[PDB]
Structure 1
Amino acid sequence: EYPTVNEIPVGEVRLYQIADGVWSHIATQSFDGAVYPSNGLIVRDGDELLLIDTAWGAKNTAALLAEIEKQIGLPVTRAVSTHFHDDRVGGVDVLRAAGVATYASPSTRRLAEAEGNEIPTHSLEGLSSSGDAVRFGPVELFYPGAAHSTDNLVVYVPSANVLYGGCAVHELSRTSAGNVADADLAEWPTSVERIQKHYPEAEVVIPGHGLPGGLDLLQHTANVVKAHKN
């Protein structure tokens, strides 16, 4: 009953309750001829919501805040973007308009500025070297070296063990690595390992696109990366 690409008209957003006070958001985008689903996270912050990743574009992101309001009723006050690609930063401006404070690592900020994609206002200190981790309200942000992009963050909800992989973790059903335009394929499976090791207590893994699952996604993701490589 996790929503899939075929049940979401582009422009619309679904919320999926992952755990007490942790939801994923799912939306769809035109990409490479195809239509992709894409995931993010919303996490209760005591009094407010912390948002991980935009809904992939202004419209979606508008649709996203509206859906939150109607289903949760708490105010999104902060947003973290896990990499500089448009499915992560696309709609920052809408979030800013909405009074949301946007964050990304300095690394993501540089890389997104260079590409002319929307740029997260604030900078996260403490993530520049691989294996680093900072606490950001109810989540831990972790920088597992380079995988799908050189700046990809992953996110742990310790009060639920929910691991959000971002675009560096593939869904089981997925057979290829993704857009590999900016990937570090050589480093990527080491980076995935750095995640396995740092988060063994993880009960749910959420991938950048597709159905969630368990720690198997990291392994699945590793094989997948190895396989594209020859």
Structure 2
Amino acid sequence: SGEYPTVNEIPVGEVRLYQIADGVWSHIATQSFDGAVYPSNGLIVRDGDELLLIDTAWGAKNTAALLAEIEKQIGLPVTRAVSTHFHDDRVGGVDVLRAAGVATYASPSTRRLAEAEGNEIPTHSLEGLSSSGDAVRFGPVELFYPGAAHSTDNLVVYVPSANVLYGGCAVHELSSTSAGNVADADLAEWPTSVERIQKHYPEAEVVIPGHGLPGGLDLLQHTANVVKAHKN
């Protein structure tokens, strides 16, 4: 009923959308992994009379449910999707998208990592993102590679029309004391990568983490703090 939807409020398999700003929504779904249930976010950005999707809903059936929820709530076609790193919460569902006519994109680094690890593989390579600080335009967003953080390939997404910063899994929510799933992370470089984000997007109004509640710019400093303390 209007609050940001939370893990115990979303059964696995259902998807909810949340309006962030004009022409910007997040998508929220839940999935089981290693015997625990987690929420995860993605983004939807209006691209004229089409939609740009950022990240899958973490699995094939969740991603099919995402497409149905978009058709119900928004009713514009998803034409392109970008995955912001190689993990299943970002690419699991790419096969569903591709069979639904959506053109799927990721950096070459993400594509290689997904292929190596047996995750679903976006079709199209996003060049111009291989050096930290790189940025490219993609429809109504800017894609930015901040450096290694949660993963070596993680991208962030900025919506300039709305000053919305989608940090993906490189950014954690304010209630997190913990740095989430660090299996593929670079804890040493992560604060430097966050500082690059902070420098590049000083006018961000909304910051969306890969998992959990959106907030403001404080999510960035909080993330750096939690990562440093984890390493400590």
Q: Same fold (TM over 0.5)?
A: yes
User: Distance in 1 between the 2:231 and 2:120 partners?
Assistant: 32
The within-5 A match list for 1:193-212 is 193-212=195-214
Q: Determine helix, strand or coil for the equivalent of 2:130.
A: coil
Q: Determine helix, strand or coil for the equivalent of 1:220.
A: helix
Measure how far apart 1:97 and its partner are. 0.6
Q: Could you list the runs of 4 or more consecutive aligned residues of structure 1 that deviate by over 3 angstroms after TM superposition? A: none
Deviations 1:74-131 (A, max 9, x none): 0000000000000000000000010000000000000100001000000001100000
User: Distance in 1 between the 2:174 and 2:35 partners?
Assistant: 22
Measure how far apart 1:179 and its partner are. 1.2
Q: Which residue of 2 aligns with 1:93?
A: 95
Deviations 1:160-212 (A, max 9, x none): 00000000000000111111111001000000000000000000000000000
User: Distance in 2 between the 1:156 and 1:23 partners?
Assistant: 13
Q: Normalization by structure 1: what TM-score?
A: 0.99
User: Distance in 2 between the 1:69 and 1:199 partners?
Assistant: 31
Measure how far apart 1:33 and its partner are. 2.4
Structure 1 alignment gaps of length 5 or more: none
Deviations 1:12-36 (A, max 9, x none): 0000000000000000011232210
Greater alpha carbon shift after TM alignment, 23-32 vs 129-138: 23-32
User: Distance in 2 between the 1:226 and 1:31 partners?
Assistant: 25
Measure how far apart 1:38 and its partner are. 0.2
Alpha-carbon RMSD: 0.5
User: Distance in 2 between the 1:47 and 1:105 partners?
Assistant: 25
User: Distance in 2 between the 1:146 and 1:32 partners?
Assistant: 25
User: Distance in 2 between the 1:73 and 1:182 partners?
Assistant: 37
Structure 2 alignment gaps of length 5 or more: none
User: Distance in 1 between the 2:194 and 2:103 partners?
Assistant: 29
| Residue 41 of structure 1 pairs with residue 19 of structure 2 | no
User: Distance in 2 between the 1:111 and 1:185 partners?
Assistant: 19
User: Distance in 2 between the 1:116 and 1:151 partners?
Assistant: 16
Q: Determine helix, strand or coil for the equivalent of 2:89.
A: helix
Q: Which residue of 2 aligns with 1:218?
A: 220
Measure how far apart 1:47 and its partner are. 1.7
User: Distance in 2 between the 1:33 and 1:215 partners?
Assistant: 32
Q: Normalization by structure 2: what TM-score?
A: 0.98
Measure how far apart 1:40 and its partner are. 0.2
User: Distance in 1 between the 2:219 and 2:191 partners?
Assistant: 12
User: Distance in 2 between the 1:24 and 1:177 partners?
Assistant: 21
User: Distance in 2 between the 1:32 and 1:113 partners?
Assistant: 21
User: Distance in 1 between the 2:229 and 2:20 partners?
Assistant: 31
Match of 2:151 among 149, 162, 171: 149
Identity of aligned residues (%): 100
The within-5 A match list for 1:4-15 is 4-15=6-17
Measure how far apart 1:6 and its partner are. 1.2
User: Distance in 1 between the 2:226 and 2:113 partners?
Assistant: 26
